[PDB]
Inverse folding.
């Protein structure tokens, strides 16, 4: 009962694993990934325009993929120009 759906890019926090790409790749909704210069333990996933990253099992199912319970998902905030 911890489903998670998002129709836009989001941030992921784990333990800095190279499998972060494969874990996200599992979701067709994922278009690309980028590491955070400020925080190495933070990654921003960019979904494909038109797709929707839905979690039928929630964040728990996602943690099983990479094999880390620390794996979390947060709403990526868009920066402002001037």
């Amino acid at each position: 009962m911890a489903t998670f759906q998002t129709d836009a890019d989001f941030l992921l926090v784990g333990d800095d694993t190279s499998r972060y790409e494969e874990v996200m790749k599992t979701f067709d909704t994922v278009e690309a990934v980028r590491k955070s210069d400020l925080d190495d333990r933070v990654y921003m996933v960019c979904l494909k325009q038109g797709s929707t990253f839905v979690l039928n099992g929630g964040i728990e199912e996602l943690r099983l993929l990479t094999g880390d319970s620390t794996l979390e998902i947060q709403p990526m905030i868009v920066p402002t120009t001037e």
Summary: The two ends are 41 Å apart (CA to CA). The domain at 1-82 is CATH 3.30.70.2070 (Alpha-Beta Plaits). The CA atoms of residues 9 and 50 lie 12 Å apart. The chain has one domain: 1-82.
